[PDB]
Amino acid sequence: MTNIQTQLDNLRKTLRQYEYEYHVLDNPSVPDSEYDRLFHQLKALELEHPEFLTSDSPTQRVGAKPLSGFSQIRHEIPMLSLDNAFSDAEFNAFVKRIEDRLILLPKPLTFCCEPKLDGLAVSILYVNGELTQAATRGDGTTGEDITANIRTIRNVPLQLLTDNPPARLEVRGEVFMPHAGFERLNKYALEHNEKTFANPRNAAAGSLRQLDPNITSKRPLVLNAYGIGIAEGVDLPTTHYARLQWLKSIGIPVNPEIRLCNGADEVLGFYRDIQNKRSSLGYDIDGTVLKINDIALQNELGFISKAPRWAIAYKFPA
Numbered sequence: 001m002t003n004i005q006t007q008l009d010n011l012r013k014t015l016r017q018y019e020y021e022y023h024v025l026d027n028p029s030v031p032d033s034e035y036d037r038l039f040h041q042l043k044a045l046e047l048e049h050p051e052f053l054t055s056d057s058p059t060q061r062v063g064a065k066p067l068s069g070f071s072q073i074r075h076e077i078p079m080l081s082l083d084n085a086f087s088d089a090e091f092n093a094f095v096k097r098i099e100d101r102l103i104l105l106p107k108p109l110t111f112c113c114e115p116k117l118d119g120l121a122v123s124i125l126y127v128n129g130e131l132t133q134a135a136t137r138g139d140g141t142t143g144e145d146i147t148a149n150i151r152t153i154r155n156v157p158l159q160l161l162t163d164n165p166p167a168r169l170e171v172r173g174e175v176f177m178p179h180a181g182f183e184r185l186n187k188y189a190l191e192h193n194e195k196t197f198a199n200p201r202n203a204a205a206g207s208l209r210q211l212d213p214n215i216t217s218k219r220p221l222v223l224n225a226y227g228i229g230i231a232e233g234v235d236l237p238t239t240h241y242a243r244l245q246w247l248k249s250i251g252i253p254v255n256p257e258i259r260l261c262n263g264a265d266e267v268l269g270f271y272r273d274i275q276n277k278r279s280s281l282g283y284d285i286d287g288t289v290l291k292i293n294d295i296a297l298q299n300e301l302g303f304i305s306k307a308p309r310w311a312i313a314y315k316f317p318a
């Protein structure tokens with residue numbers, strides 16, 4: 001044991017806990033300045049004792065060297081798309097269809113109802129708790145390695161917050177750019193004669209194709225997780241909402257607008273409410289994703305070619 005290694009371990013633990021409170025709980029327990037004083041204390045100490053620098057330390061999100069290109073990554077499990085609906089009658093038809101297909105239709109049919117984030121789909125792999133690779137969706141089968149870029153995002157933990165992480169856990173989510181960051185970015189890019197962006201979706205996509213993680217780091221990106229790919233060495237909860245609460249409880253940001261709703265009429269009220277709030281969310285959404293909450297019911301329904309039969313994106317009208 002040495003005093004330096006204890007100081008480093010303690011700063012790292014304290015800072016990851018603060019990042020979790022600030023980014024995931026939106027309830028920081030200390031001011032930003034206190035977080036930063038400990039952050040740059042860690043960073044100086046690490047630099048003064050480099051033999052103790054760890055690759056997943058909070059001070060190590062940003063590679064010092066622009067990449068020369070991105071490698072391809074074929075996903076171990078494909079990333080499917082979503083069927084979509086455009087009206088209440090069409091949503092209701094999707095539900096009656098499930099109601100008829102199911103062998104046994106449960107008393108409430110519970111949906112997990114989520115906003116449809118409008119950014120870029122990603123897959124982020126944690127091995128024994130440590131972020132080791134990230135990919136874009138690409139075409140659903142093959143995407144690109146954006147590990148270095150995903151590491152920069154402030155609300156993505158470099159290590160899961162749990163003493164028992166799964167052997168492997170792949171988090172699936174949307175990376176997107178809130179409006180305030182989007183407006184500061186376009187103001188900055190105009191005042192410096194760089195590519196202005198049409199909408200937050202495009203700013204996020206273009207920020208994630210940056211080969212220089214130093215640039216990506218200055219892009220105000222956030223993850224929200226909405227699913228799980230690989231999950232080895234853990235017993236995943238047996239409802240989708242519970243899996244998202246579990247992701248949240250181990251350090252992964254999840255959107256706070258998500259609700260459980262029983263039966264189509266309640267789901268429709270969720271849709272109307274989200275559609276109302278849309279104006280004042282501080283970020284763009286495309287509509288809602290309504291998912292059958294029970295995992296056994298989802299497995300029973302399966303996939304059509306390559307969207308779930310158990311979910312649908314009910315989009316908003318123009």
Ligand SMILES: CCCCSc1nc(N)c2ncn([C@@H]3O[C@H](CO)[C@@H](O)[C@H]3O)c2n1
Nearest residue numbers: 080081082114115116117120121174226289
């Ligand atoms: C198998 C289900 C696939 C993911 S679930 C899911 N949930 C949400 N709450 C989502 N919000 C946005 N998306 C995007 O929509 C595309 C499918 O149109 C996906 O590639 C995602 O980029 C969502 N996807």
Ligand SMILES: Cc1ccc(Cn2cc(C(N)=O)ccc2=O)c(C)c1
Nearest residue numbers: 018019022028030031032035036154
């Ligand atoms: C200078 C500075 C430092 C940190 C932050 C944001 N923030 C705050 C906390 C915090 N626990 O309160 C934790 C992580 C984090 O990213 C900002 C906006 C500016």
